[PDB]
């Protein structure tokens, strides 16, 4: 088939720098937001044409293996990926999204849909580790790309695959959603170190939907009820209005 053509952003771990990773994340944001409350809001899923529903992230590593992740522009989340002659999809939430993803990678000979969604709860269970024990950085991403690639010929076990999804979703989707998490990956690249995310990152990730709702329903930025977030040391604090989150959250779900 001659599939529908979605925008494609490239990143390689070979020779990766703070700047090249920053350019990558900035490019992903720019193609995701094609509407600003106080912070850009991702396009409404309602009435969004199929030709504008997806973007593609092509990842390459030092071994010159390439995989292509497919991102939903309405929530910045990975719905599936292509490696060579195979395409793999998380289980869709509803019939409409199931139809939308039939338009991705349609020239691939083998299409596979998992029974599990791309959510952290199930991915962590499959990986056998929580996010707080899965290291992130250029090293983990290099390994994630290879693990994703070799799943198509059975060279990757499912826990490794699920761990590699958790790495990719955070270093791409969450970093695009939050300048704070983009900064977290920047720092790992600066020290050439790999480390798991701390509670401030993990709780920010868990709070994206609630933070988005609180901001968009706020009275001139003021929240109706406070949102609890975590500090780096695990202690909690309350967020009462959108202003403190401006340097933190870069994209909001509609
Ligand atoms: C400006 C600080 C801030 C604003 C909005 C949300 C959060 C939570 C991710 C944070 C913090 C980041 C680390 C903090 C700490 O370790 O004290 S607070």
Numbering used by the authors: 1 to 34, 37 to 40, 42 to 257
Please share text taken word for word from the publication where this structure appeared.
Ricin contains an active A subunit (RTA) and a B subunit (RTB), which promotes retrograde transport into the endoplasmic reticulum (ER). RTA and Stx2A1 are ribosome inactivating proteins (RIPs), which remove a highly conserved adenine base (A4324 in rat) from the sarcin/ricin loop (SRL) of the 28S rRNA, leading to the inhibition of translation, ribotoxic stress, and apoptosis. We showed that RTA is recruited to the SRL by binding first to a conserved sequence at the C-terminal domain (CTD) of ribosomal P-stalk proteins. The X-ray crystal structure analysis showed that RTA binds the last six amino acids of P11 in a hydrophobic pocket at its CTD.
Here we evaluated the second-generation lead compounds that bind at the P-stalk binding site of RTA and identified RU-NT-192, which had 30-fold improved affinity relative to CC10501 and inhibited the cytotoxicity of ricin holotoxin in mammalian cells with no apparent cellular toxicity by itself for the first time. RU-NT-192 had a 32-fold improved Ki value relative to CC10501, while RU-NT-206 showed a 53-fold improved Ki relative to CC10501. The RTA-RU-NT-202, RTA-RU-NT-165, and RTA-RU-NT-192 structures were all determined at 1.8 Å. The RTA-RU-NT-165 and RTA-RU-NT-192 structures were determined in the monoclinic P21 space group with the RTA-RU-NT-202 complex structures solved in the orthorhombic P212121 space group. After superimposing these structures and the structure of RTA with RU-NT-206 (38), the RMSD values range from 0.23 to 0.46 Å, demonstrating no significant conformational changes in the RTA backbone upon binding of these inhibitors. Both RU-NT-165 and RU-NT-192 exhibited more comparable binding patterns, where the carboxylate group within the thiophene ring of each inhibitor formed a salt bridge with the Arg234 side chain and a hydrogen bond with the main chain amide nitrogen of Arg235. Moreover, the ethyl groups at the 2-position within the benzene rings from RU-NT-165 and RU-NT-192 formed distinct hydrophobic interactions with Leu207. In RU-NT-192, the carboxylate is rotated by 26° relative to the thiophene ring, resulting in reduced conjugation and increased electron density on the carboxylate compared to RU-NT-165. This conceivably strengthens the noncovalent interactions between the carboxylate group of RU-NT-192 with Arg234 and Arg235 in RTA. Unlike RU-NT-165, RU-NT-192 formed a π-π stacking interaction between its benzene ring and Phe240 in RTA, further enhancing RU-NT-192's interaction with RTA relative to RU-NT-165 and ultimately supporting its higher inhibitory activity. RU-NT-192 improved the EC50 by 10-fold at 125 μM and by 200-fold at 250 μM and had an EC50 value of 200 pM at 250 μM.
